[PDB]
Structures are given as C-alpha cells and as structure tokens.
Amino acid sequence: RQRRLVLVIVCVALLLDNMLYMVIVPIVPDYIAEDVKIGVLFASKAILQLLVNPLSGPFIDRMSYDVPLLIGLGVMFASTVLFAFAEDYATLFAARSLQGLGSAFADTSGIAMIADKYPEEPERSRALGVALAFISFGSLVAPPFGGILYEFAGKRVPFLVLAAVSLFDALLLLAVAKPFSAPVGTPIHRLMLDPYIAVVAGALTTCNIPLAFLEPTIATWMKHTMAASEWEMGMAWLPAFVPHVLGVYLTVRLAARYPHLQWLYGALGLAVIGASSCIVPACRSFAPLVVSLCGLCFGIALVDTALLPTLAFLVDVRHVSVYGSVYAIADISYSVAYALGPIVAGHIVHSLGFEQLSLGMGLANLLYAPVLLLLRNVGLLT
Numbered sequence: 001r002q003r004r005l006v007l008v009i010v011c012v013a014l015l016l017d018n019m020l021y022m023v024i025v026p027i028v029p030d031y032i033a034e035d036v037k038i039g040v041l042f043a044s045k046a047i048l049q050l051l052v053n054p055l056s057g058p059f060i061d062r063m064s065y066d067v068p069l070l071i072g073l074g075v076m077f078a079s080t081v082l083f084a085f086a087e088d089y090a091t092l093f094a095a096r097s098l099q100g101l102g103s104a105f106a107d108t109s110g111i112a113m114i115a116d117k118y119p120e121e122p123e124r125s126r127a128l129g130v131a132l133a134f135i136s137f138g139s140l141v142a143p144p145f146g147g148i149l150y151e152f153a154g155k156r157v158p159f160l161v162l163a164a165v166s167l168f169d170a171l172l173l174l175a176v177a178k179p180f181s182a183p184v185g186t187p188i189h190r191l192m193l194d195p196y197i198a199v200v201a202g203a204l205t206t207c208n209i210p211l212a213f214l215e216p217t218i219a220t221w222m223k224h225t226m227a228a229s230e231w232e233m234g235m236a237w238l239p240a241f242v243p244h245v246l247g248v249y250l251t252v253r254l255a256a257r258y259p260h261l262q263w264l265y266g267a268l269g270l271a272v273i274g275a276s277s278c279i280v281p282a283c284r285s286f287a288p289l290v291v292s293l294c295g296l297c298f299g300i301a302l303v304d305t306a307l308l309p310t311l312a313f314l315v316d317v318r319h320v321s322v323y324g325s326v327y328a329i330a331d332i333s334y335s336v337a338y339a340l341g342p343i344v345a346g347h348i349v350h351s352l353g354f355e356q357l358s359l360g361m362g363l364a365n366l367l368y369a370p371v372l373l374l375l376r377n378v379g380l381l382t
C-alpha cells in the first residue's frame with residue numbers, strides 16, 4: 001500500500017537535510033575574512049534545538065506528524081535559499097540558526113511517522129534501519145562532493161538547485177499524504193523521569209560525543225603529525241559508509257533472529273566505540289587511521305539501530321501509545337554533544353593535547369557501557 005511510498009520520501013528528506021549540516025562548515029571560514037567567534041556560529045544549530053524541542057515535542061503528538069513535517073521542510077527551504085544569497089556574518093549566523101529551527105521539526109516528524117506507520121516488531125526495526133542508512137549517506141559521503149562542486153562553480157547555483165529539490169520533495173509529499181482532509185499524550189516530564197528512558201538517553205549522548213569532539217579537531221592534528229595533502233585530509237570519512245550499513249544490516253538481522261538482545265547489542269556497540277576512540281591516537285599512517293574511523297563508525301550504527309526502536313517499544317508498553325514526544329528526548333540528547341563539542345574541543349586540545357582527549361572519551365564510553373545492563377529485564381514487561 002501507500003506505506004512504502006511514504007517511507008522512501010521521508011527518507012529522502014532526511015538525506016538532503018543531513019547534507020546541509022556538513023557542506024557549509026568548510027565554506028563559512030572563507031567569507032568571514034576571535035577563535036570563540038566562529039565557534040558560536042558553528043554551534044548554533046544545536047543550541048536552538050535545545051530550546052525548541054521541549055516546546056515542540058508535545059506539539060508533534062497533537063497534529064498527527066504531517067503539518068510539522070511540512071513546516072520543517074518549508075523552513076529548510078527558506079534557510080537554504082539564504083546561504084545562497086549569504087555573505088558577511090550576521091546573515092550566515094541567522095541561516096545557521098534557522099537550520100536548527102527547521103531541524104527541530106522535520107527529523108522528529110519523519111522518525112515518528114516511520115515508527116507509527118509500522119506498528120509490528122519485525123518491520124519497525126527494518127524501517128528504522130533504512131532510515132538510518134539514508135541518514136548516513138548524505139552526511140558521510142556527500143560533503144566531499146559538495147566541496148568539490150564549491151571549488152568549481154561557487155555557492156549560488158548549487159544551493160538554489162538543492163532548495164528546488166527540497167521543495168519538490170515537500171510538494172510531492174503534500175500530494176501523497178493529502179493532509180487537507182479532517183488520544184491524550186504523556187507530558188515530557190513524566191517520560192523523562194522513567195528510568196529506562198533516562199538510561200537510553202544517556203547512551204544516546206555518550207555514544208555520540210566521540211563524533212562531535214573529533215570532527216573539528218582532526219584535520220589540524222593530521223596535518224601537523226603525518227605528511228598529508230588536501231586529498232587525504234578531505235576524504236577521511238568517506239571510506240566509512242560500508243561499515244555503517246553493514247552494522248545496521250547485522251543488527252536488524254540479529255534483532256529479527258533473537259528478540260530481547262537489544263541491550264547486549266547496545267553494550268557491544270558502546271565497547272566498540274570506546275575501543276576505536278582509544279585506538280585512534282596511535283595511527284601514524286592513512287590506512288590505520290581509516291581503519292580506526294571504520295571501527296568508530298561501525299560502533300555507532302549498532303547502538304543507534306538497537307536502541308532506536310526500544311524507545312517506541314517502551315512508550316507503547318507503558319504510558320500512552322503515541323510517539324513524537326519520546327524522540328524529542330533523543331534529539332535533545334544529540335544536541336548536547338553537538339552543542340558542547342565545536343566550542344570547547346579546540347581549547348581542550350590546545351591545553352591538554354590530542355592524545356588525552358581521545359583517551360578520556362574512550363574511557364567514558366567504556367565505563368558507560370556496563371550501565372546499559374539495566375535493560376536486561378525488558379521484554380517481560382509486556
């Protein structure tokens with residue numbers, strides 16, 4: 001039925017949205033010409049998400065996951081046409097803030113719609129795997145090509161083309177869902193106080209710190225230590241798409257085979273992330289570094305695919321069977337690392353070094369990994 005047509009289009013919206021969050025970080029430092037001046041500009045997407053999601057979470061579970069998606073895809077189009085006609089600084093800051101304002105709606109609505117259109121267990125974790133595989137591509141493989149096109153054509157035409165594509169996607173979604181025709185949700189305070197939800201939300205931030213504390217402070221370290229040209233410094237995350245999709249598929253197949261092993265999968269993913277981030281400050285060549293990044297990226301996929309359906313399963317077993325207000329917690333959790341990283345990571349590296357920050361990150365992840373054992377009793381609460 002329609003069901004598949006909605007899943008594909010929502011996934012494409014998550015791919016284009018995740019491309020504009022990373023294709024602009026190399027371009028911005030060109031038009032600017034205070035190390036804490038750029039940092040706040042780069043850390044404005046997550047700051048706004050931390051003040052809008054609490055006031056937008058309960059709004060999602062009241063208008064049925066369609067009006068918020070359209071609003072988000074309109075705000076994203078408005079934000080994109082701007083970078084295109086954007087120069088100076090204030091305009092860029094406003095565009096970056098509008099990006100977060102638009103992301104506080106679209107991603108949450110899309111994930112909620114994917115989780116709600118699929119109520120059964122063997123298919124929910126299969127749809128939420130395709131959603132994550134579509135999110136990864138476009139954030140891990142696309143920014144290099146965006147930069148290559150920037151160094152050839154500029155900024156005006158590509159951004160207008162991307163805005164046109166986003167508007168086309170929003171329009172055909174409006175034509176397919178047909179929103180132009182015609183239960184009480186749990187308050188976010190009650191959801192946040194549930195111990196299992198808090199445990200899951202803590203993991204969603206611990207497993208993501210060693211991807212926002214490394215992105216802004218890897219190129220300089222690579223250039224200083226290893227003799228690397230622009231090509232390796234630019235295409236350093238590209239050979240990591242394959243481990244991500246492989247891990248997503250493996251987690252989906254294992255969840256289908258044995259239920260109630262999501263906690264084990266999450267703990268294994270946390271251990272892998274910690275081991276990779278601890279191994280990273282040892283590579284003195286391109287290939288070992290690429291392998292370490294492969295391990296780090298394969299660690300994230302397991303945790304994400306294992307613990308994303310768990311929130312919906314818990315909010316279905318207990319509380320009220322309405323989503324939208326339970327993924328705002330996940331978005332808030334992400335927007336803590338993505339707001340605290342790009343501002344203080346450089347100062348931490350400059351005051352301590354690159355060989356201690358990674359050690360601390362790995363120790364934190366490996367120490368939080370045992371905490372996920374408290375979910376071993378889930379599956380009998382049904």
Ligand SMILES: CC(=O)OCC[N+](C)(C)C
Pocket residue numbers: 135136139140208297300334
């Ligand atoms: C590696 C990767 O998937 O990056 C996506 C960012 N994230 C985890 C917030 C969706």
